[PDB]
Amino acid sequence: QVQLQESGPGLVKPSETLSVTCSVSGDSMNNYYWTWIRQSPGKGLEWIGYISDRESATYNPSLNSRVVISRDTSKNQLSLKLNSVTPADTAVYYCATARRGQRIYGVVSFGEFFYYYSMDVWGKGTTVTVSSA
Amino acid sequence: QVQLVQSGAEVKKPGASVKVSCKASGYTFTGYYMHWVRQAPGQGLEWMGWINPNSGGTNYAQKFQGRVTMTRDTSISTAYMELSRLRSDDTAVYYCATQVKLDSSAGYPFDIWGQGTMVTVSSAS
Amino acid sequence: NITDGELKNCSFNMTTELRDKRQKVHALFYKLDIVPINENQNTSYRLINCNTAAITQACPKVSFEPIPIHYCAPAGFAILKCKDKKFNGTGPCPSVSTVQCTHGIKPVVSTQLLLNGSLAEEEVMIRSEDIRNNAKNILVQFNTPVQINCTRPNNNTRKSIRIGPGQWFYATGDIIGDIRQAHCNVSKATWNETLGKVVKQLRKHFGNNTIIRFANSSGGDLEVTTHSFNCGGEFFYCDTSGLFNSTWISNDSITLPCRIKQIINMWQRIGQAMYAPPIQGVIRCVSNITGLILT
Amino acid sequence: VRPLSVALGETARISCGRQALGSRAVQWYQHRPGQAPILLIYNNQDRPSGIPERFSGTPDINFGTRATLTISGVEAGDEADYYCHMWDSRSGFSWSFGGATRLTVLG
Ligand SMILES: *[C@@H]1O[C@H](CO)[C@@H](O[C@@H]2O[C@H](CO)[C@@H](O[C@@H]3O[C@H](CO[C@H]4O[C@H](CO[C@H]5O[C@H](CO)[C@@H](O)[C@H](O)[C@@H]5O[C@H]5O[C@H](CO)[C@@H](O)[C@H](O)[C@@H]5O)[C@@H](O)[C@H](OC5O[C@H](CO)[C@@H](O)[C@H](O)[C@@H]5O)[C@@H]4O)[C@@H](O)[C@H](O)[C@@H]3O)[C@H](O)[C@H]2NC(C)=O)[C@H](O)[C@H]1NC(C)=O
Ligand SMILES: *[C@@H]1O[C@H](CO)[C@@H](O[C@@H]2O[C@H](CO)[C@@H](O[C@H]3O[C@H](CO)[C@@H](O)[C@H](O)[C@@H]3O)[C@H](O)[C@H]2NC(C)=O)[C@H](O)[C@H]1NC(C)=O
Ligand SMILES: *[C@@H]1O[C@H](CO)[C@@H](OC2O[C@H](CO)[C@@H](O)[C@H](O)[C@H]2NC(C)=O)[C@H](O)[C@H]1NC(C)=O
Ligand SMILES: *[C@@H]1O[C@H](CO)[C@@H](O[C@@H]2O[C@H](CO)[C@@H](O)[C@H](O)[C@H]2NC(C)=O)[C@H](O)[C@H]1NC(C)=O
Ligand SMILES: *[C@@H]1O[C@H](CO)[C@@H](O[C@@H]2O[C@H](CO)[C@@H](O)[C@H](O)[C@H]2NC(C)=O)[C@H](O)[C@H]1NC(C)=O
Ligand SMILES: *[C@@H]1O[C@H](CO)[C@@H](O[C@H]2O[C@H](CO)[C@@H](O)[C@H](O)[C@H]2NC(C)=O)[C@H](O)[C@H]1NC(C)=O
Ligand SMILES: *[C@@H]1O[C@H](CO)[C@@H](O)[C@H](O)[C@H]1NC(C)=O
Ligand SMILES: *[C@@H]1O[C@H](CO)[C@@H](O)[C@H](O)[C@H]1NC(C)=O
Ligand SMILES: *[C@@H]1O[C@H](CO)[C@@H](O)[C@H](O)[C@H]1NC(C)=O
Ligand SMILES: *[C@@H]1O[C@H](CO)[C@@H](O)[C@H](O)[C@H]1NC(C)=O
Ligand SMILES: *[C@@H]1O[C@H](CO)[C@@H](O)[C@H](O)[C@H]1NC(C)=O
């Protein structure tokens, strides 16, 4: 029973910091994973990467690896930093949560399994439009 | 003639690996076992192990368990013996022996021997 | 493209019935039948046997399944069978019978572990030629067979290509399904009970109070270190280290991995190497392990 | 981007574009323009909390079949874009959601 509410600047010139924080309201976080989704008008959803308690920050091999995700336990917030932005990157950004499950078909002693993440609870999402004006 | 040649080795430093060879001729090489024995200067003999060149099945004593490796290249009828993580008390002479000719059928004892190679170590130069 | 592997897809040129045409075909090869040639450092592979010896295929119109074979003596000779329940290997035998000739025998090839043998009676048997010297393998025969199930869950496909006028060449064209390792299962409680029985029987030859320990193979080959056998038309090599890993003094089954080879060199010789055609579908072999061979 | 026009009262079935190879796990998502995407089915047989039991999943037994989401008893609320998410064993880690489909109702 958790709700996430994001806040961002919206209009920002290219090649500066774009930080959209999604504040949390509900129970404490101990096992759930978190994820950010980008959606551009005309294209589908963009699974950019997920965050965990192991300081793991992996992303798509085609996103040039220029965005970083961070979580502060003091303020209990989650933020993202994406530098060198392009005016053609206007999109809506959702901050949601997800859970990891495993699927076994062979023998566990040899590692015949694989993981998969499912985003159960979502957020609201706001649209950011970047340009030189 | 039934005989076994070896290759002399130089003094090695502690913590190094030695390479011992043993080449036979005459009789068929893939029919009988082959043992390895050591002799310390001024002491008695001590058995190291035995290798079967027919199938590569080896068996060595517990004094050298986990420190010696024995191989075989039957394409040229030669054997090998490796040994790393040396010490100072391993200064001795090594021999490779077979049992090519004897009335009895048991594996022991062996009669024919080879030239032999004396291997010794030195801490410094 | 399995991210971080047992088999690899290889593509190569091949002739045709027409002596001038050259086709390009691809197949799947296991990792134990391929050796690099460059090493500095690109990927250019070749087979293992045709550096030293030649190779012949085993056209699949015949089978390798063992069948009973009776050895029957000619007219003029006879066979004598001993029926003692304490035949320690050498010496007289009170109960002697004369039979026309023997019963069926299954000439099954195996290493480190007998298979489909003959069960003992009322006890386990521990035989050898000389026990007091370390130069003779010791035979052990159980009194109750242990069940063992080997399986390769892959789903292979036979792909046939032409190699010349009137010839054919089979290969594993594709694996459809889930890439997984072929394994073999053995019951745990029965194995521990059998090991207890055999050590209790072996204690008679080495003092009434001694420590008995087991260890895995020494090493130095791919045929007498692992457990090697054949079934369903395929040759397996299942590691047996997970069995002789105990120490004796005074429903949760065990699993064992298995590798598969194709270009074998069985019946040790020179100038010969037997290819094995792939079997289509899945393989499942149940066996009665009964014997043991221990240095 | 692929439309599918099915009138009211007809039971439609939409499948995923990219087929799978081996052990399979498919997830379904629905997205309306302006709203938030909500999942429909996960693990190919499980039903989440807060969904009518009218969307029957595709059980994956005796591999050789395909994945397809059906709609039984369509209403005014079941008209949006659909997304299929594939996870298998012989492809590694899937990142993109792939192509999507759009459903339209008649009458
Ligand atoms: C040689 O021996 C080896 C040694 O065992 C043999 O190896 C095994 O091989 C079998 C088959 O080859 C293999 O089974 C495979 O297992 C998978 C997974 O099974 C697991 O999960 C399902 C579903 O579940 C989840 O949901 C239930 C209900 O809600 C929960 O109770 C459960 O805990 C699971 O929750 C998990 O997921 C949640 C997310 O959904 C997560 O939040 C949780 O935290 C959990 O992680 C189970 O149904 C299944 O179990 C079952 O066993 C029951 C008792 O026998 C039966 O009623 C049913 O089968 C029941 O499903 C299991 O727990 C299956 O999906 C495959 O179908 C397959 O069976 C097994 O993993 C291997 N390993 C072991 C240790 O057994 C080998 O086969 C053998 N070979 C030969 C040739 O002899
Ligand atoms: C030890 O003896 C076993 C006999 O119980 C033997 O198992 C049999 O092996 C065959 C070989 O493929 C299996 O398949 C055979 O039987 C099926 C029956 O449908 C036929 O379709 C096949 O063509 C083939 O003839 C058997 O399933 C299997 N079990 C039995 C009960 O027959 C083991 O293979 C023997 N061990 C070794 C190492 O050979
Ligand atoms: C190995 O893969 C085969 C190809 O998919 C598969 O074969 C068939 O079986 C399915 C399941 O019943 C049928 O739907 C299909 O028509 C069959 N096709 C042919 C050509 O036979 C095998 O079943 C798979 N192996 C195993 C053990 O399932
Ligand atoms: C080994 O390589 C061959 C050729 O590169 C693969 O064969 C083709 O497989 C690809 C899959 O990436 C298909 O797109 C092609 O249509 C296939 N045929 C041809 C003529 O290219 C083969 O699949 C590879 N092996 C494995 C196990 O993936
Ligand atoms: C090897 O395979 C046989 C054949 O399936 C297994 O035997 C059976 O055991 C299962 C469960 O233990 C029973 O459901 C079957 O009814 C049994 N059948 C027979 C003919 O006995 C055997 O358990 C397998 N071995 C191991 C170690 O699991
Ligand atoms: C037999 O069992 C021993 C038990 O460990 C295996 O041991 C070792 O060798 C491995 C690789 O050579 C090392 O990774 C291990 O650390 C090492 N362990 C010990 C205790 O020495 C050995 O490999 C097994 N032999 C075979 C042929 O499987
Ligand atoms: C053999 O001669 C023919 C003559 O047309 C020529 O086309 C062919 O190329 C020659 N052989 C080959 C295989 O090149
Ligand atoms: C056949 O050989 C030529 C050159 O020797 C090579 O370019 C070609 O790729 C080979 N065929 C295949 C299918 O690889
Ligand atoms: C079998 O018993 C005889 C009778 O004394 C004995 O001479 C022989 O050594 C024994 N052999 C074994 C293998 O026990
Ligand atoms: C052998 O037994 C020991 C006992 O603890 C265990 O740690 C080890 O993993 C076992 N070896 C194998 C290969 O299972
Ligand atoms: C294996 O043992 C069981 C139980 O005694 C027996 O029924 C079966 O026939 C045996 N297998 C063979 C191949 O004899």
Numbering used by the authors:
A (entry chain N): 1 to 82, 82A, 82B, 82C, 83 to 100, 100A, 100B, 100C, ...
B (entry chain H): 1 to 52, 52A, 53 to 82, 82A, 82B, 82C, 83 to 100, 100A, ...
C (entry chain B): 137 to 140, 152 to 186, 186A, 187 to 309, 312 to 321, 321A, 322 to 397, 411 to 455
D (entry chain Q): 8 to 66, 66A, 66B, 66C, 67 to 95, 95A, 95B, 95C, ...
Show sentences the authors wrote.
BG24, a VRC01-class broadly neutralizing antibody (bNAb) against HIV-1 Env with relatively few somatic hypermutations (SHMs), represents a promising target for vaccine strategies to elicit CD4-binding site (CD4bs) bNAbs. The VRC01-class of bNAbs targets a particularly challenging epitope to elicit bNAbs against due to the presence of the CD4bs N-glycans that sterically obstruct interactions between Env and Ab CDRs26. The glycan at position N276gp120 is highly conserved and poses the greatest steric barrier to binding VRC01-class bNAb iGLs, as Ab residues in the iGL CDRL1 that interact with this region are typically 11–12 residues and cannot accommodate the N276gp120 glycan.
Two iGL versions of BG24 Fab constructs were made starting with the VH1-2*02 and VL2-11*01 heavy and light chain germline gene segment sequences: one containing the CDR3s from mature BG24 (BG24iGL-CDR3mat) and the other containing the iGL CDR3s (BG24iGL-CDR3iGL). We solve two single-particle cryo-electron microscopy (cryo-EM) structures of GT1 in complex with BG24iGLs containing either mature or iGL CDR3s at 4.1 and 3.4 Å resolution, respectively, in both cases in the absence of chemical crosslinking. Cryo-EM structures of BG24iGL-CDR3iGL and BG24iGL-CDR3mat Fabs bound to GT1 were solved at 3.4 and 4.1 Å, respectively. The GT1 complexes with BG24iGLs included density for CD4bs N-glycans attached to residues N234gp120, N363gp120, and N392 gp120. The CDRL1 interface with GT1 in the BG24iGL-CDR3iGL and BG24iGL-CDR3mat structures showed the longer CDRL1s in the germline precursor VL domains in different conformations, demonstrating CDRL1 flexibility consistent with cryo-EM data processing. Indeed, the local resolutions for the CDRL1 in these structures were poor and resolved only after iterative rounds of focused classification and local refinements. In BG24iGL-CDR3mat-GT1, atoms within these Fab residues were separated by more than 5 Å from atoms within gp120 residues; thus, this is not defined as an interaction.
